[PDB]
Amino acid sequence: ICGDSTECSNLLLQYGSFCTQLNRALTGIAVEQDKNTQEVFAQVKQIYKTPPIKDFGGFNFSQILPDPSKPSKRSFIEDLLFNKVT
Amino acid sequence: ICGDSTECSNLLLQYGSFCTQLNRALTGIAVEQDKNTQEVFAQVKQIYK
Amino acid sequence: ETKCTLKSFTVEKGIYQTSNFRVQPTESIVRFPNITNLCPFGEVFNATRFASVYAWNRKRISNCVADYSVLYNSASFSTFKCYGVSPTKLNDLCFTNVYADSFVIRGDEVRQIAPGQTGKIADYNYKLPDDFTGCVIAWNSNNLDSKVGGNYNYRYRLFRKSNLKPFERDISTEIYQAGSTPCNGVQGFNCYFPLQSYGFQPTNGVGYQPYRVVVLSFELLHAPATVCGPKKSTNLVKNKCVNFNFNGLTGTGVLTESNKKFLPFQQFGRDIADTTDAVRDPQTLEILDITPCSFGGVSVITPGTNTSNQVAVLYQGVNCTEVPVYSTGSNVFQTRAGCLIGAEHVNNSYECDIPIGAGICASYQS
Amino acid sequence: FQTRAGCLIGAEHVNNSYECDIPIGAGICASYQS
Amino acid sequence: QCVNLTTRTQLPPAYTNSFTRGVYYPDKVFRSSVLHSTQDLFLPFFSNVTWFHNPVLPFNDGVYFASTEKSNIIRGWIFGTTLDSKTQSLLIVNNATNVVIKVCEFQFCNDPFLDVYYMKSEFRVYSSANNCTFEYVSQPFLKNLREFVFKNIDGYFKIYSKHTPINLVRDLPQGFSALEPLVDLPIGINITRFQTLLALHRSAAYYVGYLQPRTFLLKYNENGTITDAVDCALDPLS
Amino acid sequence: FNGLTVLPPLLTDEMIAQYTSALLAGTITSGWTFG
Amino acid sequence: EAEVQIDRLITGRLQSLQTYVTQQLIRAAEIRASANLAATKMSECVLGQS
Amino acid sequence: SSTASALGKLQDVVNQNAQALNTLVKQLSSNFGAISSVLNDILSRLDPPEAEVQIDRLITGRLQSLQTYVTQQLIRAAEIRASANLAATKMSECVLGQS
Numbered sequence: 001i002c003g004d005s006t007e008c009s010n011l012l013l014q015y016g017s018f019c020t021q022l023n024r025a026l027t028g029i030a031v032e033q034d035k036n037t038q039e040v041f042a043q044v045k046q047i048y049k050t051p052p053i054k055d056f057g058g059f060n061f062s063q064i065l066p067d068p069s070k071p072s073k074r075s076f077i078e079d080l081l082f083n084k085v086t
Numbered sequence: 087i088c089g090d091s092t093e094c095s096n097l098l099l100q101y102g103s104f105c106t107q108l109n110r111a112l113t114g115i116a117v118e119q120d121k122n123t124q125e126v127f128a129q130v131k132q133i134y135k
Numbered sequence: 136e137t138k139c140t141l142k143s144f145t146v147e148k149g150i151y152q153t154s155n156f157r158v159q160p161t162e163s164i165v166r167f168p169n170i171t172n173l174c175p176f177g178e179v180f181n182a183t184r185f186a187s188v189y190a191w192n193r194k195r196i197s198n199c200v201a202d203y204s205v206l207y208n209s210a211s212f213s214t215f216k217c218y219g220v221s222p223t224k225l226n227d228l229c230f231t232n233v234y235a236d237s238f239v240i241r242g243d244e245v246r247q248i249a250p251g252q253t254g255k256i257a258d259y260n261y262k263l264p265d266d267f268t269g270c271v272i273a274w275n276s277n278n279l280d281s282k283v284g285g286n287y288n289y290r291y292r293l294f295r296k297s298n299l300k301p302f303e304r305d306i307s308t309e310i311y312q313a314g315s316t317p318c319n320g321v322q323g324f325n326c327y328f329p330l331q332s333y334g335f336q337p338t339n340g341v342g343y344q345p346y347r348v349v350v351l352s353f354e355l356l357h358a359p360a361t362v363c364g365p366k367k368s369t370n371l372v373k374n375k376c377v378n379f380n381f382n383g384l385t386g387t388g389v390l391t392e393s394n395k396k397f398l399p400f401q402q403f404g405r406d407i408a409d410t411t412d413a414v415r416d417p418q419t420l421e422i423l424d425i426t427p428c429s430f431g432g433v434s435v436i437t438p439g440t441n442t443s444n445q446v447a448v449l450y451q452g453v454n455c456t457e458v459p460v461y462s463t464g465s466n467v468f469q470t471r472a473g474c475l476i477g478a479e480h481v482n483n484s485y486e487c488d489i490p491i492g493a494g495i496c497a498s499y500q501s
Numbered sequence: 502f503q504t505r506a507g508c509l510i511g512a513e514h515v516n517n518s519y520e521c522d523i524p525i526g527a528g529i530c531a532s533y534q535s
Numbered sequence: 536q537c538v539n540l541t542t543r544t545q546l547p548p549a550y551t552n553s554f555t556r557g558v559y560y561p562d563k564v565f566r567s568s569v570l571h572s573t574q575d576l577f578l579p580f581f582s583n584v585t586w587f588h589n590p591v592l593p594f595n596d597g598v599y600f601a602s603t604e605k606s607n608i609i610r611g612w613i614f615g616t617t618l619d620s621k622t623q624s625l626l627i628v629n630n631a632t633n634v635v636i637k638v639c640e641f642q643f644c645n646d647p648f649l650d651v652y653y654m655k656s657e658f659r660v661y662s663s664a665n666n667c668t669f670e671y672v673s674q675p676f677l678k679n680l681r682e683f684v685f686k687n688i689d690g691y692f693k694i695y696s697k698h699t700p701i702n703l704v705r706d707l708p709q710g711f712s713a714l715e716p717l718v719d720l721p722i723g724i725n726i727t728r729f730q731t732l733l734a735l736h737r738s739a740a741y742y743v744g745y746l747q748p749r750t751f752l753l754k755y756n757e758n759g760t761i762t763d764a765v766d767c768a769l770d771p772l773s
Numbered sequence: 774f775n776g777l778t779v780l781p782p783l784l785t786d787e788m789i790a791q792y793t794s795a796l797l798a799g800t801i802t803s804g805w806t807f808g
Numbered sequence: 809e810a811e812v813q814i815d816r817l818i819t820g821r822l823q824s825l826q827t828y829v830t831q832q833l834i835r836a837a838e839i840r841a842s843a844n845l846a847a848t849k850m851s852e853c854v855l856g857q858s
Numbered sequence: 859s860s861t862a863s864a865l866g867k868l869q870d871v872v873n874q875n876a877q878a879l880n881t882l883v884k885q886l887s888s889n890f891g892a893i894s895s896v897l898n899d900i901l902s903r904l905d906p907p908e909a910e911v912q913i914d915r916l917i918t919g920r921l922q923s924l925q926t927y928v929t930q931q932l933i934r935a936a937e938i939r940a941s942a943n944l945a946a947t948k949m950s951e952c953v954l955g956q957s
């Protein structure tokens with residue numbers, strides 16, 4: 001509102017406390033976003049790992065399992081999804 | 087808010103783009119209503135008799 | 136600060152936002168063009184003769200340095216009043232296209248020079264726009280514009296079909312049809328001459344003595360500046376959060392050399408949303424750049440007044456290069472969320488107690 | 502053409518019936534073939 | 536020093552398409568990679584433009600004057616109300632050296648001209664000039680086409696210029712190019728009509744269009760040069 | 774009116790009734806297999 | 809003075825319109841939630857046994 | 859890999875957020891009835907007694923714009939939270955067990 005002006009700050013000071021509620025709403029929004037992500041993804045207690053030998057009765061999961069070569073440790077489909085969207 | 091008055095429109099023009107947002111919101115609401123009806127009712131691929 | 140913001144003498148474990156940090160400007164810089172020629176103002180003010188009110192004299196002055204202090208402090212003027220700019224700030228602004236209009240009116244018509252004013256001179260001889268910006272000066276001229284033999288060279292328009300548009304000149308003198316029949320150049324009944332003379336005499340009292348009135352009109356940022364006030368220009372400073380006064384345009388930021396490719400006719404570029412980005416100094420004609428001085432909120436991490444009374448301070452989104460009261464308190468750590476002072480980085484990995492961000496967080500042991 | 506939603510110009514009217522891609526309203530819509 | 540010209544030269548009032556020419560920079564603010572919408576005076580797209588193959592033409596509000604002149608036969612311009620000493624008049628001439636801009640109560644006869652002898656010095660365009668207002672001199676303006684835009688707003692005479700080689704024979708090129716601001720004259724004249732000057736041999740194609748107030752959308756490239764424009768009211772698609 | 778307008782819905786009542794008829798015929802004849 | 813009077817009328821009418829739009833947004837969100845519930849009920853209790 | 863427009867929802871959310879930010883920052887360039895849109899100029903040109911009126915106009919306009927932005931943000935966040943709850947329920951019921 002003021003952009004580093006003393007007079008504007010002095011005039012805004014007499015409008016009561018409107019800015020505290022404004023900042024408190026945005027803070028609640030941010031905390032809610034973090035809680036949403038945490039409660040949608042953190043569903044297990046330990047980190048499991050696939051065995052080095054992969055013989056799943058003929059089913060092929062190579063397209064979805066992570067690729068250690070890539071630094072991101074993301075799968076093929078995850079890379080495609082990340083590249084497709086801007 | 088002006089009722090076809092030129093000077094009223096000119097005076098309103100210096101309040102920025104409040105009305106574009108208001109027009110956008112109502113169109114969003116209408117599209118939402120059509121989507122609601124379409125998804126609740128259209129769930130069959132064909133028409134049986 | 137945390138106690139004051141929470142309005143409580145006790146604080147539970149967590150992270151809180153107290154205030155915001157911002158860098159302060161150090162010095163100031165002024166850059167004005169290579170112009171020092173004086174501005175002729177007494178020639179139009181101390182002129183012997185002024186034109187009539189219906190044929191008011193107009194002059195355009197540019198490429199000069201004018202001092203408004205010498206005009207304001209002079210008490211020889213009867214009326215000194217401005218509209219758009221306070222007089223004390225006139226010396227601090229640089230304008231272009233200064234117009235000076237001079238004319239002579241009567242004692243009671245001084246009120247007619249005003250926006251949205253109704254009368255006779257205000258609508259039949261000279262019309263002032265509603266959105267006029269500038270200033271108006273008036274003074275008495277009885278000792279020089281009044282003759283014992285009577286002054287009749289001073290005339291004013293009296294008859295016209297309608298009113299006059301602002302800044303419109305009328306010189307046509309044709310017989311007026313005040314009835315329903317053509318006059319055909321006959322001044323009889325229902326036919327009056329549009330011009331009415333004056334009876335300026337020294338024996339006449341107040342309200343009829345001759346008065347000389349001039350006006351000054353300006354513009355606001357329509358072209359490169361040409362006429363400024365008395366000011367001194369300093370040099371240029373690179374990589375410093377300072378406030379600048381480039382050609383009357385004031386701002387605050389850090390100035391850096393820019394590689395943008397202007398064209399010989401612009402003065403200052405921008406990107407979007409009326410955000411000035413690069414400017415050109417009049418003296419050197421260099422493509423500069425403007426970047427806002429860094430800022431961001433500050434946060435405090437505490438394990439609770441129940442346990443201890445030592446805290447850690449995080450500056451959000453700020454490079455750990457310009458931290459400074461608590462700068463030399465403890466170690467400095469650089470995160471993706473900003474800089475952190477008062478805590479020690481470790482190579483272990485435990486559960487998260489007080490989240491900080493970017494995947495890292497702190498806990499109490501220290 | 503005249504429709505329950507108003508008046509349409511620049512579009513032809515046909516007896517056929519296809520899947521709806523550019524909705525217009527009142528149970529009718531238009532598509533590019535013209 | 537002029538006489539009535541017996542040879543009543545006749546130039547047919549041809550009409551042709553304006554296409555997409557007549558765009559000039561509206562201000563001096565550099566922008567890059569941005570789409571900016573602004574409302575101002577402009578020549579409407581795909582309008583009807585008059586081609587002359589030297590009468591009196593009303594000035595209206597604005598004039599877009601184009602000439603595919605060869606060997607620089609076009610000389611200058613005349614502006615005024617009655618083109619006589621009774622009223623203030625404006626004259627622009629582009630002679631062999633630096634140009635001349637003069638504002639006086641110039642007196643003109645029926646057919647003013649410059650003329651040349653085959654050293655080259657002949658100047659009898661007018662007959663009298665008693666009271667003058669303004670004088671200005673700068674660099675000369677001059678197969679190759681020259682486009683000029685004249686605007687008289689708030690006592691300011693803005694002249695925007697652009698010259699480009701052309702290889703097409705007759706019709707206007709179907710392309711886009713901006714018109715950078717060339718000259719600003721801080722003199723206010725109540726113009727209503729204007730003329731043209733020719734370098735007659737003492738021993739003819741030009742295009743005229745008018746401006747209207749409307750809104751345009753302009754695209755700026757990386758270097759700040761306008762490369763595309765759209766008229767707001769020409770087509771539902773626009 | 775004073776600047777307020779009402780837009781008709783895209784789906785008319787007849788088409789909604791036809792959808793309901795199709796759903797009910799499918800659930801009567803074929804059981805739940807048609808889903 | 810017409811600018812002053814028009815300004816007062818404009819600010820009042822604009823404020824009222826904003827209030828109306830906000831109420832409409834809230835009501836639309838509630839109706840959307842109800843429609844989602846109805847769609848789920850149709851999907852589950854009609855196309856199969858629950 | 860080949861077909862585009864398969865990720866409409868996330869792109870729409872991003873576009874809505876960016877557009878809201880853009881219009882919020884663009885509203886700073888409106889007179890709101892005062893004589894100028896930049897507060898530095900009105901400070902450096904005109905005396906306090908009615909300059910303060912001008913800043914009052916600027917203040918009320920900008921505060922109203924900020925309030926509208928905050929309310930829109932709250933509505934959108936509520937919608938996003940509902941969608942996140944649905945996603946969590948689907949992930950618990952269809953990934954960790956046969957539904």
Ligand SMILES: *[C@@H]1O[C@H](CO)[C@@H](O[C@@H]2O[C@H](CO)[C@@H](O)[C@H](O)[C@H]2NC(C)=O)[C@H](O)[C@H]1NC(C)=O
Pocket residue numbers: 060061062063
């Ligand atoms: C599972 O599918 C992947 C598909 O990517 C197979 O990987 C391909 O295998 C063929 C045959 O050797 C190679 O020509 C391709 O270059 C491989 N593609 C990639 C991206 O590596 C993989 O072989 C399949 N798994 C099994 C056990 O056959």
Ligand SMILES: *[C@@H]1O[C@H](CO)[C@@H](O[C@@H]2O[C@H](CO)[C@@H](O)[C@H](O)[C@H]2NC(C)=O)[C@H](O)[C@H]1NC(C)=O
Pocket residue numbers: 176177178180181209210211
């Ligand atoms: C016009 O003339 C007046 C005198 O009538 C000038 O005013 C004097 O200016 C000198 C400047 O050194 C002062 O010392 C005198 O005290 C002034 N006297 C009065 C009566 O004002 C004025 O400077 C002249 N020029 C203008 C007004 O532009």
Ligand SMILES: *[C@@H]1O[C@H](CO)[C@@H](O[C@@H]2O[C@H](CO)[C@@H](O)[C@H](O)[C@H]2NC(C)=O)[C@H](O)[C@H]1NC(C)=O
Pocket residue numbers: 454455456
């Ligand atoms: C904080 O500022 C320093 C100083 O510029 C940054 O260090 C520079 O980083 C760039 C890019 O890696 C290098 O090209 C420079 O040579 C570095 N300069 C110095 C003096 O080290 C540092 O990257 C900045 N920190 C952050 C988080 O942006």
Ligand SMILES: *[C@@H]1O[C@H](CO)[C@@H](O[C@@H]2O[C@H](CO)[C@@H](O)[C@H](O)[C@H]2NC(C)=O)[C@H](O)[C@H]1NC(C)=O
Pocket residue numbers: 630631632633634635655656672
């Ligand atoms: C073309 O016009 C210029 C004016 O721009 C003429 O230059 C003038 O020449 C006369 C004669 O010596 C000088 O008195 C003037 O001072 C010159 N004007 C300027 C601005 O330098 C030039 O002579 C003209 N050329 C012709 C008619 O062939």
Ligand SMILES: *[C@@H]1O[C@H](CO)[C@@H](O[C@@H]2O[C@H](CO)[C@@H](O)[C@H](O)[C@H]2NC(C)=O)[C@H](O)[C@H]1NC(C)=O
Pocket residue numbers: 396756757758
């Ligand atoms: C815009 O400016 C850029 C940067 O100067 C130009 O890019 C290079 O310009 C030089 C000299 O004109 C050429 O030799 C290079 O080949 C250009 N690099 C490219 C094209 O990648 C650019 O030409 C200018 N004009 C435009 C239309 O972009």
Ligand SMILES: *[C@@H]1O[C@H](CO)[C@@H](O)[C@H](O)[C@H]1NC(C)=O
Pocket residue numbers: 169417418419
């Ligand atoms: C202004 O004057 C200085 C000092 O004489 C000189 O260095 C500079 O080039 C001048 N600038 C212009 C634009 O003339």
Ligand SMILES: *[C@@H]1O[C@H](CO)[C@@H](O)[C@H](O)[C@H]1NC(C)=O
Pocket residue numbers: 441442
């Ligand atoms: C926290 O407060 C409780 C109650 O006063 C006290 O028993 C406990 O010791 C406190 N914890 C610490 C770490 O001081």
Ligand SMILES: *[C@@H]1O[C@H](CO)[C@@H](O)[C@H](O)[C@H]1NC(C)=O
Pocket residue numbers: 480481482
């Ligand atoms: C361990 O921490 C120290 C600082 O305490 C650091 O210098 C070192 O690089 C770290 N080593 C590893 C393997 O993380």
Ligand SMILES: *[C@@H]1O[C@H](CO)[C@@H](O)[C@H](O)[C@H]1NC(C)=O
Pocket residue numbers: 515516
């Ligand atoms: C096809 O449309 C035309 C146009 O009105 C109409 O006359 C004709 O009856 C229609 N035929 C059918 C089979 O719908």
Ligand SMILES: *[C@@H]1O[C@H](CO)[C@@H](O)[C@H](O)[C@H]1NC(C)=O
Pocket residue numbers: 550551552582583
């Ligand atoms: C211009 O007008 C003439 C008649 O005045 C007409 O013949 C011609 O077709 C018009 N040009 C265009 C492009 O419409």
Ligand SMILES: *[C@@H]1O[C@H](CO)[C@@H](O)[C@H](O)[C@H]1NC(C)=O
Pocket residue numbers: 616617725726727
């Ligand atoms: C301009 O000149 C025309 C005649 O050419 C005249 O009718 C008009 O009133 C003049 N306008 C002004 C403002 O002098």
Ligand SMILES: *[C@@H]1O[C@H](CO)[C@@H](O)[C@H](O)[C@H]1NC(C)=O
Pocket residue numbers: 620621640665666
């Ligand atoms: C030119 O100025 C003189 C000097 O006042 C004047 O007498 C003459 O009438 C003016 N010329 C015209 C055409 O008005």
